Amino acid sequence: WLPAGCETAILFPMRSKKIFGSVHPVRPMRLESFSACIWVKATDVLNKTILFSYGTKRNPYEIQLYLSYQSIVFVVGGEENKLVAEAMVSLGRWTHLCGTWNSEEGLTSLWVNGELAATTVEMATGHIVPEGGILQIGQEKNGCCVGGGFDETLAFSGRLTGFNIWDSVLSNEEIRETGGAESCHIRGNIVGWGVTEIQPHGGAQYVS
Amino acid sequence: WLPAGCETAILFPMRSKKIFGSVHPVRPMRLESFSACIWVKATDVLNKTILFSYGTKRNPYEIQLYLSYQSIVFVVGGEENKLVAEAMVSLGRWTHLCGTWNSEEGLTSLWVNGELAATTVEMATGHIVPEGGILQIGQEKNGCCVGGGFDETLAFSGRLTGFNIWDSVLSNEEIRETGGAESCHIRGNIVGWGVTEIQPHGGAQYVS
Amino acid sequence: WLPAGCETAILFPMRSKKIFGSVHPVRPMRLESFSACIWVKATDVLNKTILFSYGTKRNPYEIQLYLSYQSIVFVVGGEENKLVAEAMVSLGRWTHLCGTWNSEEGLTSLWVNGELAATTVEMATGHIVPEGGILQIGQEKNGCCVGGGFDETLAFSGRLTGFNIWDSVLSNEEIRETGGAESCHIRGNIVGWGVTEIQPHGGAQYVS
Amino acid sequence: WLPAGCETAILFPMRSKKIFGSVHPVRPMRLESFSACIWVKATDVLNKTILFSYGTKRNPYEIQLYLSYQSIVFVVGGEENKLVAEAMVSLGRWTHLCGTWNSEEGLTSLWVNGELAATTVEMATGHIVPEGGILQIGQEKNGCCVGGGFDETLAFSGRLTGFNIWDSVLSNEEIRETGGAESCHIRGNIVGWGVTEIQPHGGAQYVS
Amino acid sequence: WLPAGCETAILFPMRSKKIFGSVHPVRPMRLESFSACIWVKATDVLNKTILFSYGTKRNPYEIQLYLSYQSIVFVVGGEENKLVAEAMVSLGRWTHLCGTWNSEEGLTSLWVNGELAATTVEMATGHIVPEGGILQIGQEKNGCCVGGGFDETLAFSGRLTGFNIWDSVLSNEEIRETGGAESCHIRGNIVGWGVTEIQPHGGAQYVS
Amino acid sequence: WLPAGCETAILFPMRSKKIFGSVHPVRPMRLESFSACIWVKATDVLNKTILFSYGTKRNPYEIQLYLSYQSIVFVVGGEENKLVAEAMVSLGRWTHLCGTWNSEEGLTSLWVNGELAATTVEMATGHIVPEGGILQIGQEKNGCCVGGGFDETLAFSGRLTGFNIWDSVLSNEEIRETGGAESCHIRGNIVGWGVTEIQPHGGAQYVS
Amino acid sequence: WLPAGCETAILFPMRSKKIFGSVHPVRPMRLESFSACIWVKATDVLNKTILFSYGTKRNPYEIQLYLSYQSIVFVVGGEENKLVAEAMVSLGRWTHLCGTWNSEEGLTSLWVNGELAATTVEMATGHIVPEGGILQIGQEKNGCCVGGGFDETLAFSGRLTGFNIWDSVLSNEEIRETGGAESCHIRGNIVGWGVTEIQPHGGAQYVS
Amino acid sequence: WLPAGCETAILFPMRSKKIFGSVHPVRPMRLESFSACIWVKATDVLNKTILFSYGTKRNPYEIQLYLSYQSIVFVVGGEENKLVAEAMVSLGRWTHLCGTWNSEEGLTSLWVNGELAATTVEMATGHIVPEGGILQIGQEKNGCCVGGGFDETLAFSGRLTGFNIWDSVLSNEEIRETGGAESCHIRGNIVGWGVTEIQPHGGAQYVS
């Protein structure tokens, strides 16, 4: 079974030092504001489980969404800048997680299953995300084919689908639409599920 | 679920610079008239989305069928010769397309879901399709193994099945039969679905 | 859907110059009498479609079962020795074939869907099948590691399952049992489905 | 169909000389006591069919669970130390098999489908399982780079799932819970199904 | 032994339907005038033996240098335009071949071993070499990922080294310098030996 | 060091069950008469060491040249037809072996180091070598993709070079020329060294 | 020819987006002072040509040695901390480079061909090089499995050998010894040539 | 340059966790007496550097020869049974090492460069080396693919050639012959250099 009428997913059977998936956007990743939603079905959540992470050479923490024991942490700009939802994490159940960001005044937010879960102001005000980064799902940026691999602790185990990124802050109506029962045909422009190239590596598999 | 009782398809999870599928006919492709049907289910359509393309080194535009928004364009001989349907394609729904051609008087036709959608005369009159070319599905003839790859804009994302080519012009009764509820055992002679060799590349997958 | 109770099959999506599957028995193939059954679901039957073939260096035609239009030909020893059944096999439907042989005075027989279809006597009398040959399904003995070589005409396209070989002549009760609705747990000793090693090559797939 | 709501398994289509799966625990395997459960569905059982085996360089028989006809043999420390269940395993049916061990004075036991099947005392008393060995499923350590090497007789053919190892002797309530109808979310700490790395080799396949 | 003091070459042990080498320039190939030199040691010269070829999708004959028995044919723009030096090639001996082109008035030349061998005027006057094509050595453009494809007759067998391309017509002094005994460090800007990426395919080998 | 000024060879470092090299002639192998020479340097000569072998499906012994303990055996048509030299082969020394055949009257001969060593008459008179077989060096025809299969006893260990085949019986002057110190540029038409495709397999290596 | 007494090297025939070599030290790279020498023969030096680079996740610029036209730049800690020897490099000639660093007082030095070329004080005083980074030769850490992802401008083209790293500042006598004609047996402890694992990638190859 | 006139060797450029070479004898390794000689040229000799090792499942130390700083240790049967020569091995120069064993009275010996270096009596008296073990050069025991790897400490770095094993104790004259300047043509029967299959893995490569 699949969450909202989507017909494809990616399976992480296990968390190891080689498993991850890489995203290749078609247009530059420089952003003034953005939105990014995804579907998750977690098997085991640890001290810090990376869902997706965008990072550059000088700063590996440009954008980062990950799960703690019972909370969702959304990071923009750096570690000190983070927004935390309280007690809205589950295991073995499909759940939708969307979050927006605006650089004009640092408005960031988190929505879980179509309902606001967190919000703050004056986060990374005036910041701009640069180009030339590496976008990944299920793992953080680190050496590949060199060194011991990735940190086995931060990896992800479960299923992912519906990974979309927009170049603007979606309105409330759009955000509730994206999590609906017929929401798998609306895809973002920077990244879209089904049109953008996503290459599983190290053991991740496409499943239909 | 697949249409007309077919039990195999090909999946294009993404449109990238390396994804395509190649067809290897058993007999020469030299033709004076031909017919070609296919089942398609598109995910996203750009200004030009190649379904299948046949071309030699001298002329890469011998035969070509592609989608542009809600229109269907059928090309024989070159760009100047093209037949266009208006609003006969959707997204996320299985649809049957079949095109007809005759070099004796240049009669071309397009049928969508068993109904005539376009017709023309004096198209490539007296022209003979050469032999020894290359036939792909979902991509256009270009540098495949080495180079800059293909143009990602023209690639295809979705599902395809039931790709048949005949060496003659099918009659109206045969054309309506081919899109029937039990038409998946009607295969053409130049190319037949299930007997001819089709090799997905670069990320395309059989869904058998 | 699988024929009787089996939960694994092999798919030949296409007939080409590279597709086949090889069988590696655990014990010698030297035999004075044998029985062999199989499930087939043919897509397109040509003038000679090989199902399975056992051949040695000096004689590539030791044992051979194949289809020719709506007829079944069973060969032991050589071409001159063949048993033919008429109007037995159809396309796109699961059917059970099983052949019997005895070297004492050449009793050979063919059963289709549990019913006798042919029988003859004094075939290859006194002949002993040698050992050290190559056993294959869906193709005939020929060079394979030269980029091809296999005759594209004789190959097979469809699904196969339940390939068993016994070292003796099964009785009538056993033969009718092997084609029942709870027969997939009855496996032969020389070759058994799910116990013996079978390696698809060139495009054949397991469709468990 | 899979047991206890598990959504993944590993398939052994055959027992060749190269088929096995390797487990890579995160933490050391030095144990004073342990408990290890698994789901199995066997196709054919020989004189000795290995399910999982842990062994070091000096002692290849540190821990071993295997089937012999209709009996289950559990080995800790060597051949002389074995516990045998009489007539409590079948073919083609999912069955749960757990077994605990205590090093304090050698309490070992076997449970089949949540019911005690065997028990003994004073087995490998004072023994400590070393660390730095190799853990495998479906085969015994012989060598994977000798052009094969594994003895085909001992290999396994069927399906496996739910392989967990704990660092302590589970209580009776815990064991009946693990064998329950919704127990697939109860995973052990030394090895857990879905979090620990398991790499099928030589023909074994993940199936969903 | 290699000429002019070069430590590397490329070996074509044989001419088949897969052997070639591809060049990946760092800057666009759009040119108004150019020069291009190379070292050859031919084993067997045929009716037409391609040394290097540049071609686009529309026009596969943009630039070509090839050997025809004991002659050298230099092609710019198309097949109709060609310059033929005559009686100035051998087998099994290193030889240097350069040629310049100017689009302002269509001046073309050919130098063999530092001596002018041919010259013409009004060749492809006003023509501009497009950009975005494919550059190769030892073969023509189309025929990859087709199961061979390349014409076995036109391929090359021997050794090549010192392949350089400039963006301007080299003067006479520079041309005589390039074929000197200390010229292997004189590399062009569009393509340079030892700086530009040249990856052999299909059986070609780097040799030192 | 290599003989007669040849600059390439093939190394067989070991005789195994997978080592061999395959030849792909451009034109058909149907022959009325032929001549075939080769350079050989043997490391260990066993009861029968294959140099090159041509065989079809129905007759694996069409043409065969191999070495015995101290003799060279040349076979045309079948095992019963063979010509044997007596004491004219050594180990670790380059030696030229050439033999001709004529079907008009069955004249066969063997030359070793430019000197005639054997001759016979009425050998395979009226025979014609079929076409569509497999040509190999260092091994005899047998299954190769099965996984090993080749009999290690008959394999070859050493170095080979200068393998040429003509379509006619070379005269005495040509035969003495082919073994000279400036002969490595004399290549045959059916097969030529450095022009015909010869791809080693299983551990054989090109060496320069 | 090799520089002093070494018998292996690594060849970079070209600079592309994939070529580099990775080093796997046996012991941790945490250092308070170090020395590092290398043999280099450059083909083309650009605005910045990386020889070797050590960097962590938070700081890709921990240690760096690279060539800029006719100068040598040695970097410890970050960009602002650099030592620049000037006019001490050529092209196509073997040259020995070695630099030392001390964290107690920030003493850094550069030696070229056994002669001091630069010296500085108060460079990264009190700094400790972290551990758990990635060490590479000929490239900078940017990305491996993202379809290249290496800046082609910074790559290296030429030959390298004798890469050693010590855990202490070598004395003047040791430094002049390391560049001698009998020095290839003097290997460092953190990294040693011929003892430490160095696996080239993307086109680099060992040569001996 | 190689010793005694041998054309091939094996290179171990590094000490890693995956480098080794495996030997596949033709006949059983069951022995009551044997001899085994080899040519070695060590780069760095650590506390224990394995040259070759034969071991079975129940006993990984059946036969073992290795270097310990400037000593040579020869092991038959187990750890307690060892013969140690002293000051006999250096670094960077080729040296011949032979050793014989007799089970009748437990006579063991070691020769270095053709001169006796050690001798003992009553070593493994009455012992018989079992059959079905695994023979390797440069590494101790298995773990190649998924065990995690080998112990990098025991690996070997340098060059090896001339590895021969006889089934009997060679006489003194034979032993001095085997280390001569024309000794590369005499090879053992159980294992012979050039006829037996030796397959380098993980980085080792043949060199000529």
Ligand SMILES: *[C@@H]1O[C@H](CO)[C@@H](O)[C@H](O)[C@H]1NC(C)=O
């Ligand atoms: C979980 O991660 C946080 C990171 O902020 C860390 O502070 C905390 O100690 C971790 N908790 C456990 C139980 O490891």
Ligand SMILES: *[C@@H]1O[C@H](CO)[C@@H](O)[C@H](O)[C@H]1NC(C)=O
């Ligand atoms: C689509 O292509 C046509 C060429 O036929 C061009 O005229 C048109 O501008 C294009 N439209 C878009 C949206 O790119």
Ligand SMILES: *[C@@H]1O[C@H](CO)[C@@H](O)[C@H](O)[C@H]1NC(C)=O
């Ligand atoms: C089929 O093969 C048979 C050989 O028994 C031959 O006689 C017949 O002509 C063939 N028919 C066709 C249609 O190829």
Ligand SMILES: *[C@@H]1O[C@H](CO)[C@@H](O)[C@H](O)[C@H]1NC(C)=O
């Ligand atoms: C089954 O294994 C047992 C192990 O104790 C041994 O007797 C023999 O190998 C087999 N016995 C039978 C009756 O097959």
Ligand SMILES: *[C@@H]1O[C@H](CO)[C@@H](O)[C@H](O)[C@H]1NC(C)=O
């Ligand atoms: C050589 O090629 C030329 C191409 O212009 C052709 O005209 C000519 O016939 C060829 N010669 C031979 C002998 O094939």
Ligand SMILES: *[C@@H]1O[C@H](CO)[C@@H](O)[C@H](O)[C@H]1NC(C)=O
């Ligand atoms: C060598 O081969 C021949 C083949 O004719 C055989 O007759 C002979 O016995 C063999 N000799 C040995 C010693 O194996």
Ligand SMILES: *[C@@H]1O[C@H](CO)[C@@H](O)[C@H](O)[C@H]1NC(C)=O
């Ligand atoms: C060379 O690199 C330096 C880096 O400091 C830069 O400032 C300079 O502009 C570069 N020179 C050229 C010609 O690119």
Ligand SMILES: *[C@@H]1O[C@H](CO)[C@@H](O)[C@H](O)[C@H]1NC(C)=O
């Ligand atoms: C060298 O190895 C031997 C093995 O017997 C060991 O006893 C000894 O301590 C080692 N020496 C060093 C310096 O580690």
